[PDB]
Amino acid sequence: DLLAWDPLFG
Amino acid sequence: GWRREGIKYRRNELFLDVLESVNLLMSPQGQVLSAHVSGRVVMKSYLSGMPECKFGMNDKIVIEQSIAIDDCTFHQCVRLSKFDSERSISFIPPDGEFELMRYRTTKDIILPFRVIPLVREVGRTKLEVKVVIKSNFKPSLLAQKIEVRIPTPLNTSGVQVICMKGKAKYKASENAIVWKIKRMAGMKESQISAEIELLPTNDWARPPISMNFEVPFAPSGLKVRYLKVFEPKLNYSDHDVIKWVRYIGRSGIYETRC
């Protein structure tokens, strides 16, 4: 389930 | 010692996996008798060269929503002097996958489910057993793989059971009613009701109700704030690195006495 990966920005 | 020289990737990318087990023993009066979270952070990276990294989280010590770590250890790559002096987590990682940190918390845990049992001993031949579960987390998140295990007496004659969501079955082999729900959003509730016919004897000793579940957050309250990267020879930074984080919270021993 790739929707479980959140981006880390900054 | 942890990384060979000369590593090259066309695509600089990393993935952080925050993996937690939440444990509970609750009294029938809703008193927490025990609770803890066992966590670890796994880092998988494809970074060129010899990147200098920093891992930031919502640790109370640096943010004074922040969390109390009772105890933690780190991979050998982490500079413990800087964690002691600054509460900074600084390292050149191994290539590929490794366990960056393992930790334990006991304070301000998010207990993702509240279990509310109701047991009525009717005559000496009937038990009524009802359980409400309540999802205690944001409405935009889904728990999955939900199981509620309700113990039955050894002199059970028969069970009738219905539930408001999911499916429930009496498993005589396991002396339990097993209630399974595939998915449940936060700030929801459901209910199971069982009528247990008992074999008459002359003259109940209840195990707890246990749950299994997976939630897409850290019940410790841990949030990853950053993973800074600097490679001085190749001169790439953060902005050049594609970075991902996943949170998986699973039940450990998650028991509510009835």
Numbering used by the authors:
A (entry chain BBB): 107 to 116
B (entry chain AAA): 160 to 223, 239 to 377, 381 to 435
Q: How is this structure described in the published paper?
A:
Proper operation of the pivotal CME cargo adaptor AP2 requires membrane-localized Fer/Cip4 homology domain-only proteins (FCHO). The AP2 complex, composed of α, β2, μ2, and σ2 subunits, is pivotal to mammalian CCV formation, and its deletion is embryonically lethal in mice. We dissect the network of interactions between the FCHO interdomain linker and AP2, which concentrates, orients, tethers, and partially destabilizes closed AP2 at the plasma membrane.
These binding modes are likely to be in dynamic equilibrium with each other. Thus, C blocks of all muniscin family members can bind to the α-appendage platform in a manner that is competitive with the binding of FxDxF and DP[FW] motifs of accessory CME proteins, and in addition, the partially overlapping WxxL sequence found only in FCHO2 can bind to the Cμ2 YxxΦ cargo–binding site and therefore potentially stabilize the unclosed but not-yet-open form of AP2.
